[PDB]
Design a protein around this ligand. Structure first.
Ligand SMILES: O=C(O)C(=O)Cc1c[nH]c2ccccc12
Lengths: 387, 387
């Protein structure tokens, strides 16, 4: 086995070689959502509950969200419009079985097309979705839809949540770097088909989710040692970390039950995240001798307007750092795990079109944060690519 | 940066430094299961169905199984004894929220005790279970029960199934080898609380499972560069592969629904596996100049007696090869993902008590096979350690 381990692994940093995104072709305007939502769920007369919802939507800083669920589909699925008075899991599982792999496929083809290499070269697949209805998981169905080789090594990431956009990058880094020639297809596909439900005055937290969550899928090609003049890297995955904020189990959570996926959200999420964000930064960048957070490009899971404002304030980030992040939240809302990837795409695109010296708005180092159930925080250190 | 990557990764092969296992306290005798099972589910009047089940149990080559579900718990949950006449998911989720982590912690504490080092050195956790009830996944709960550091990087492997015992080793290899000093706690915790239900003439493809599935949890400590005279490896994870057998989608499957997790196993599984197992061996061992399957030690997921028989005959293995495998199936039945880890533990133990020259029955190289929904086959090439 002399030199076997050395030849088996890769040499450089895992690099994002392409980013593709997709969304259901149904843009839903936030300005008119309160009326639509309360009408379609049969709660038009509950003015006070609708006004609380209007309030939440109006302050969400989300102009629109793409949604698989349409008035037609909801009219054919009354049970999904209820809160919890009747079961709806089975019906939702059917929707997921079709929609999650579909968006995943669409986003993956875009990433594959950009990458410009044959899909026969894809060696691994990391597939993530809040939930998956059966066994095999959706990772199997997506691979089949894409016509990937049967020997592609799959890993499904389910029920992790909104922080998984970071999780999949952390996982892809080790796969790409420890396997010479490896090319990992990374996909995050999310849809509110599993969380959408009628409003309830005794569960205002669920109400907030109904105003923030949107649908979408992201796809990446990750690999180390990109081929000169053939493959093109936009970002390098340098270092990662994951940590749980102590004593915050009920801050963000969900439950898969007969009524489908229910979620819980506490108002303290903003404080909890900002109070622990500083340490994530020091632990991540001390080794790089960086202490000025404004010298980095930023990517933050847009869990909610408040979280972003609180993080921006606590760390004294100048107004431009979260522009790409807020831009995505405004145009797509909270697409869970897929969010940070759309933001990375927005970042590199804005950099090229503004004539920046790097894919990271002219800066060398950057940080990407994923937040979710735990409360869990995923930290990803990125390095941009010269333009 | 180049120096950074070199320092960031580990030097040698990912090695198994400890193996721990656990099972519910209730041992269920197979010889008397038909009467108990048909009684507790109120099917004593279905004589033909009962006789069919009896023969399945009698030919299962399974002497006993440990089960979380006792007569007392089943009496307090009649919804679980039904087939699909009434929803039972919610009741099952509650059981899982309790049992999966309980078994997980027990096995993990044992492996950690064998490892002999502080749990503060555990840097990663890979946790696997057929299903998980909420978000966070069970990986979160287990980390908490074990008192792991908040910054331990977690990866939950859900709804992969019986082949996942191989999947986690494939994942642990990259995590351990690409991270210098990394010590990965790998856990598989399975329980029939989620699959147990009454027999049904209309779903015979779901009957065999009730006779074979059992409960149990396994835990391993995987790490590269074991500290001399301190840590002790019993196996090295050399090479891995995953593939899907052509047109066998419905051969092994499951669905998470309002009635709980339903499953189906086609009679063609033994044939499918044996007709593709040869190519798996060639693709895995040709590079090591090995063509004689009998010169390797073996670990095979005991999906069922027939699978083991067909594999043995197809690869013309001598009578001794599947002994450890058949021994675990006899004493524990099919514990899904955990099986191959129990078998690995049995293999090393027997080797050291029979005076063999290595932890692999005196042989240098070995293979470990995981089978499941896909139909998927995980291949893990192992190297024993001198004794
Ligand atoms: O032994 C195998 O190959 C299986 O996948 C059997 C099995 C055990 N537990 C299950 C749960 C859902 C689907 C299949 C199984």
């Amino acid at each position: 086995f002399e030199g076997f381990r050395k030849l088996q692994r890769a040499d450089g940093f895992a690099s994002i070689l392409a980013i593709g995104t997709a969304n259901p072709p149904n843009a839903v305007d936030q300005s008119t959502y309160p009326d639509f939502y309360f009408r379609i769920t049969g709660n038009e007369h509950n003015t006070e509950l609708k006004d609380k919802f209007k309030r939440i939507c109006e302050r969400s800083a989300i102009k629109q969200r793409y949604m698989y669920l349409t008035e037609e589909i909801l009219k054919k699925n009354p049970d999904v419009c209820a809160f919890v008075e009747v079961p709806s899991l089975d019906a939702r599982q059917a929707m997921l079985a079709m929609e999650v792999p579909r968006l995943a496929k669409e986003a993956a083809e875009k990433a594959i097309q950009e990458w410009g290499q044959s899909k026969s070269g894809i060696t691994h697949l990391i597939f993530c979705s809040t939930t998956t209805p059966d066994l095999p998981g959706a990772d199997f169905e997506v691979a089949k839809l894409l016509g990937l080789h049967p020997s592609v090594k799959r890993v499904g990431v389910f029920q992790h949540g909104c922080f998984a956009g970071g999780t999949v990058l952390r996982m892809a880094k080790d796969l790409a770097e420890n396997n010479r020639g490896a090319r990992v297809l990374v996909i995050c596909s999310e849809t509110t088909a599993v969380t959408f439900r009628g409003p309830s005055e005794t569960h205002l937290d669920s109400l907030v989710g109904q105003a923030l969550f949107g649908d979408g899928a992201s796809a990446l090609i990750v690999g180390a040692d990109p081929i000169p003049q053939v493959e093109k890297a936009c970002f390098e995955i340098v270092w990662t970390a994951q940590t749980v904020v102590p004593n915050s189990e009920g801050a963000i959570g969900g439950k898969v039950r007969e009524v489908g996926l229910t979620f819980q959200l506490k108002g303290a999420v903003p404080d909890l995240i900002s109070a622990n964000i500083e340490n994530c930064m020091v632990e991540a960048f001390s080794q790089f001798k960086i202490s000025d957070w404004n010298k980095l490009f930023w990517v933050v899971h847009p869990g909610g307007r408040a979280i972003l404002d609180r993080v921006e304030a606590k760390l004294n980030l100048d107004p431009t750092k979260l522009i790409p992040t807020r831009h995505v939240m405004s145009e797509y809302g909270n697409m869970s795990s897929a969010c940070v990837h759309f933001i990375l795409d927005q970042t590199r695109k804005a950099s090229l079109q503004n004539g920046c010296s790097t894919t990271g708005e002219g800066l060398e180092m950057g940080v990407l944060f994923g937040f979710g159930p735990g409360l869990t925080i995923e930290t990803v250190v990125l390095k941009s690519v010269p333009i």
